[PDB]
Paper text:
During bacterial cell division, filaments of tubulin-like FtsZ form the Z-ring, which is the cytoplasmic scaffold for divisome assembly. In Escherichia coli, actin homologue FtsA anchors the Z-ring to the membrane and recruits divisome components, including bitopic FtsN. In E. coli and many other bacteria, FtsA is the main membrane anchor for the cell division ring, the Z-ring, which initiates and organises division.
Using X-ray crystallography, we demonstrate that Vibrio maritimus FtsA crystallizes as an equivalent double filament. The lateral interface in the VmFtsA double filament is almost exclusively formed by contacts between IC domains. Each FtsA monomer contacts two subunits in the opposing protofilament, forming the FtsAi-FtsAi* and FtsAi-FtsAi*−1 lateral interfaces. Both interfaces have local twofold (C2) symmetry as indicated in Figure 1b. The membrane-proximal side of FtsA and MreB double filaments is flat. Interestingly, the FtsN suppressor mutations E124A27 and I143L16 described for E. coli FtsA also map to subunit interfaces in the VmFtsA double filament structure. To corroborate, we designed a lateral interface mutant of E. coli FtsA based on the VmFtsA double filament structure: EcFtsAM96E, R153D (right). The lipid monolayer assay showed that EcFtsAM96E, R153D was indeed deficient in EcFtsN1-32-dependent double filament formation. However, Cβ-Cβ distances in the VmFtsA double filament structure of 3.7 Å for FtsA3x HA, D123C and 12.6 Å for FtsA3x HA, Q155C indicated that cross-linking with BMOE with an expected cross-linking distance of ~8 Å might be inefficient, which prompted us to try thiol-directed cross-linkers of different lengths.
Residue numbers in the entry: 8 to 389
Write the structure that this text describes.
């Protein structure tokens, strides 16, 4: 069957077509990419711009798969993404847990007073409890009288999700499911082995950075900040008086996250606006602009872990990340992220990349594809 994932980002839009296989693997058949215009902080700013930009990437990806695209799996992120842990319970009719006995138990967990500005997009039943038998992941067929569930809720702003959905429908597609950007990137960068000990995946992009914490194989918290790779590009464009279109080229090419990792002999050529000569600038001086901003972006991540570990260690649940912090997304490709993050996070830090991709491994390499390939891992589960 044909499977499609769509990552509408603040900088680039990525579309991926894939095939389902018996063992549970994703054979990617087609890939598409296009720059995104009219998009800020994870949400849209110009609807007509993203409709063309998301049709540009979805048209070159169906050509590269020889099949028309109908249903897609889109991703969305933003500061409105909130995570809630809720508990539900219910009786067990006939002393044998069926599917109805769980939906009624999950229904009680997600029936909360949320409002209307918010809408829930993920409901993740984690651990069940059938009559003093705690720690049960899938209680189908088990015998008992009463069950208890702890369900993880992830909600988002409704109006900021309606704008993203309309851009996909305006192209002639139908959305099958909306996936959180940090949850998809997590589900395609770390392995189940990395989930048992503990991990903290961050998806630093252009508009937003997406945080996900797994301590034991279950999502423990979800938090999103609207400061990312575009807030540091402006820092370059401001401190040196150059356009953002030019300050972005001297960041992708000559960017460094730690000023003590570039020699004093490295010089970069920053242009000038209007038609004036381009003066040479020390790459170390440019790295001295990128470093203080990247450490603040990780201070928000490090203080989020501290507040979550204080709610997990003080609650009788696994709380330590023995595998450290994993950095994915386009902004995690700048020189020195590993050494800049290890200086703020006491734990180890690595940079994740989409793994175990079958075919088309010439465009599914760098970590700015982790979200798009995480939607494929989410659409495989059907
Ligand atoms: N080699 C590089 N060095 C430094 N920064 C880079 C590099 N390559 C890309 N970036 C940064 O990556 C950012 C966008 O990358 P990415 O594809 O992860 O974003 P996105 O998915 O569109 O955004 P979002 O997080 O809003 O979904 C840009 O701000 C750019 O500055
Ligand atoms: Mg992204």
């Amino acid at each position: 069957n044909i499977i499609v994932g769509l990552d509408i980002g603040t900088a680039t839009v990525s579309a991926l077509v894939g095939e389902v296989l018996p063992d549970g693997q994703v054979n990617i058949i087609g890939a598409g990419s296009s720059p995104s215009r009219g998009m800020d902080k994870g949400g849209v700013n110009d609807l007509e711009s993203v409709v063309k930009s998301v049709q540009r990437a979805v048209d070159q990806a169906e050509l590269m798969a020889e099949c028309q695209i109908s249903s897609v799996f889109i991703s969305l992120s933003g500061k409105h993404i909130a995570s809630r842990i809720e508990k539900g319970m219910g009786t067990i009719s006939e002393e044998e847990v069926s599917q109805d006995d769980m939906d009624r138990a999950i229904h009680t967990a997600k029936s909360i007073k949320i409002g209307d500005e918010q809408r829930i997009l993920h409901v993740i039943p984690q651990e069940f409890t059938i009559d003093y038998q705690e720690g049960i992941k899938n209680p189908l067929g088990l015998s008992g009288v009463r069950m208890e569930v702890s369900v993880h809720l992830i909600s988002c702003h409704n109006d900021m999700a309606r704008n993203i959905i309309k851009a996909v429908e305006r192209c002639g597609l139908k959305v099958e499911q909306l996936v959180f950007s940090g949850l998809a990137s997590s589900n395609a960068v770390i392995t189940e082995d990395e989930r048992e000990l503990g991990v903290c995946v961050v998806d630093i992009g252009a508009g937003t950075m997406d945080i996900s914490i797994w301590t034991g194989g279950a999502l423990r918290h979800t938090e999103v900040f609207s400061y990312a790779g575009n807030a540091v590009t402006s820092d370059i464009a401001f401190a040196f008086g150059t356009p953002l279109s030019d300050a972005e080229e001297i960041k992708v090419k000559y960017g460094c996250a730690l000023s003590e990792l570039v020699s004093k002999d490295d010089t970069v050529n920053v242009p000038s606006v209007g038609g004036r000569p381009s003066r040479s600038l020390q790459r170390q001086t440019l790295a001295e602009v990128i470093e203080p901003r990247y450490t603040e972006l990780m201070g928000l991540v490090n203080q989020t872990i501290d507040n979550v570990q204080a709610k997990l260690r003080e609650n009788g649940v696994k709380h330590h990340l023995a595998a450290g912090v994993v950095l994915t997304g386009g902004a995690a490709q700048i020189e020195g992220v590993v050494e800049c993050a290890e200086r703020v996070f006491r734990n180890q830090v690595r940079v994740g990349k989409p793994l175990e991709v079958s075919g088309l491994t010439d465009y599914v390499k760098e970590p700015y594809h982790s979200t798009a390939v995480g939607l494929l891992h989410y659409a495989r589960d059907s």
